[PDB]
Amino acid sequence: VNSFSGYLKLTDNVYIKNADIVEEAKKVKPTVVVNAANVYLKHGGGVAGALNKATNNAMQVESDDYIATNGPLKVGGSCVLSGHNLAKHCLHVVGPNVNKGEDIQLLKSAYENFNQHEVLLAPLLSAGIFGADPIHSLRVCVDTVRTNVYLAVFDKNLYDKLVSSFL
Numbered sequence: 391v392n393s394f395s396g397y398l399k400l401t402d403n404v405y406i407k408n409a410d411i412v413e414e415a416k417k418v419k420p421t422v423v424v425n426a427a428n429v430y431l432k433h434g435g436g437v438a439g440a441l442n443k444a445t446n447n448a449m450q451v452e453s454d455d456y457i458a459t460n461g462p463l464k465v466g467g468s469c470v471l472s473g474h475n476l477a478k479h480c481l482h483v484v485g486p487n488v489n490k491g492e493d494i495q496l497l498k499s500a501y502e503n504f505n506q507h508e509v510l511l512a513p514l515l516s517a518g519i520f521g522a523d524p525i526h527s528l529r530v531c532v533d534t535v536r537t538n539v540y541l542a543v544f545d546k547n548l549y550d551k552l553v554s555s556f557l
């Protein structure tokens with residue numbers, strides 16, 4: 391038993407809710423919150439911008455030190471950093487950004503990072519401003535992640551569509 395509340399169960403291991411991931415993280419304090427990162431860990435908008443804002447920019451400060459030491463992530467890759475006031479840890483995962491022309495097949499590789507964590511609160515990778523089809527992203531999630539994932543979908547209209555179209 392865990393503390394996530396109000397989720398619809400999609401599969402054995404995937405759950406979904408119409409929620410603001412920032413508010414969900416602050417209430418749940420999950421072990422892992424996933425950020426929809428880019429390779430530079432520049433948290434300017436979308437989920438990243440909102441998570442970073444909720445940390446009072448501490449996420450960005452930590453991220454800039456990470457990049458200065460290690461260089462950029464790979465598309466499809468990830469790193470574990472602090473969760474600040476939102477979670478124990480933040481798993482920064484880089485899904486392909488369709489608005490940059492990145493290969494959508496890398497979306498499966500991105501979701502594979504979730505398998506290194508038993509339970510995660512996460513957004514749909516490559517959705518929103520990353521330009522992928524969220525229905526496709528949900529399908530890849532379900533077909534790739536084997537650990538327990540709680541998906542927060544900010545847009546109620548999208549949440550209902552994802553549920554109604556789920557196979």
Ligand SMILES: CCC(CC)NC(=O)c1ccnc2[nH]c(O)nc12
Pocket residue numbers: 409410411412426435436437440513514515517518519542543544545
């Ligand atoms: C998954 C990408 C997209 C789908 C609507 N979400 C956002 O761009 C976003 C922006 C700001 N705050 C948020 N909180 C949350 O859960 N998602 C967001």
